[PDB]
């Protein structure tokens, strides 16, 4: 569940043409004079997943994800990712014999399962080897710009955040649905009697 290398390309206003390595589990800082080449792969993950809370990624057409859609040299939405499974806990049943994987995605008509024409699901596997569950904001993606939103928060939202470990509202809604269903079905049982 540890990223090894990230060699991606195909985006408009940032800085390609090298690979990053040595993704140690603890410390890989960010310091430079040009911000165009510091942490933009996170921005790439933003359009990979499609987080709609920030406007810097959502536009009229998605083709802004490519390097100027082709009028600058790169037409295909190229992204190459080599991911190795350091641990066996993030590997589901049937994926034990595939710790290392290399996925390329585009030629922006369709994606590539390891180089075979297929739908956009490939990118999911392209991030599957590091347990990056794209359903929830958790699983190494980020907590996000909520850093600047959680200021001046009352007690009720804090209690909600603390109960989010149990989600008592979810079970309460499920129990309310169960109660309505059981009322209707007990009326049906009375009709049957």
């Amino acid at each position: 569940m540890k990223v090894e290398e990230l060699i991606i390309d195909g985006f408009k206003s940032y800085a390609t043409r090298t690979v990053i390595t040595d993704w140690d589990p603890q410390f890989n800082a960010i310091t430079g004079l040009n911000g165009s080449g510091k942490s933009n792969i996170l921005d790439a993950i933003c359009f990979v997943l499609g987080i709609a809370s920030m406007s810097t990624v959502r536009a009229s057409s998605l083709q802004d994800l490519i390097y100027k859609r082709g009028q600058a040299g790169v037409t295909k939405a190229s992204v190459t990712i080599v991911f190795d499974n350091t641990d066996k806990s993030n590997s589901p049943i049937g994926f034990t014999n595939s710790p290392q994987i290399s996925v390329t995605r585009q030629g922006t008509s369709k994606y590539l399962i390891n180089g075979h024409r297929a739908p956009q699901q490939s990118v999911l596997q392209l991030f599957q080897s590091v347990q990056l569950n794209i359903n929830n904001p958790n699983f190494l993606i980020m907590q996000g710009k909520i850093t600047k939103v959680l200021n001046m928060k009352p007690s009720e939202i804090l209690s909600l955040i603390e109960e989010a470990a149990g989600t008592k509202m979810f079970e309460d809604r499920r129990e309310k649905a169960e109660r309505t269903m059981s009322k209707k079905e007990t009326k049906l049982q009375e009709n049957r009697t």
């Binding site: 603890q26 410390f27 890989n28 960010i30 510091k38 790169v74 603390e162």
Partner: protein
């Protein structure tokens, strides 16, 4: 669950912000179940809330609460949005020290807001830049 979060709040606020720990005390004479507040402290002195804190020391308690929420579902990847403007470089170095001595197993990176900052970690991504994505029939007789 509330006992665990209350016992965690103290150490979480104590380790990151030095000499200032708090407790998940209810708001106004109630129980933690139906109400809870925070008594933020400014280092050595003991004040009521984080309103008197600076911007950097406020982002510190913000990220401490973020880590308290994320510790239920951990993940070895952290991102900080270069909020060392109001804070000091030495305070951020101490924060990184506390991270590597408490948050072992968490890749810490920074998004570039103000260039030329956050050199507190051992490894750092340098600046090499070109075009697109960041990088370093007798029956009756018998019967009757």
């Amino acid at each position: 669950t509330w006992e665990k979060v209350t016992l965690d709040f103290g150490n979480i606020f104590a380790d990151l912000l030095p000499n200032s720990f708090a407790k998940l005390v209810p708001c106004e004479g109630k129980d933690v179940t139906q109400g809870l507040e925070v008594k933020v402290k400014l280092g050595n002195i003991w004040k009521e809330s984080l309103i008197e804190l600076s911007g950097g020391q406020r982002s510190l308690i913000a990220l401490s609460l973020i880590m308290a929420l994320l510790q239920f579902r951990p993940a070895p990847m952290y991102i900080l949005d270069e909020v060392d403007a109001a804070l000091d470089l030495s305070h951020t170095q101490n924060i990184g020290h506390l991270i590597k001595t408490r948050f072992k197993g968490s890749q810490f990176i920074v998004v570039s807001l103000k260039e030329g900052m956050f050199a507190n970690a051992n490894r750092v991504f340098r600046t090499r830049f070109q075009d697109g994505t960041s990088v370093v029939x007798x029956x009756x007789x018998x019967x009757x």
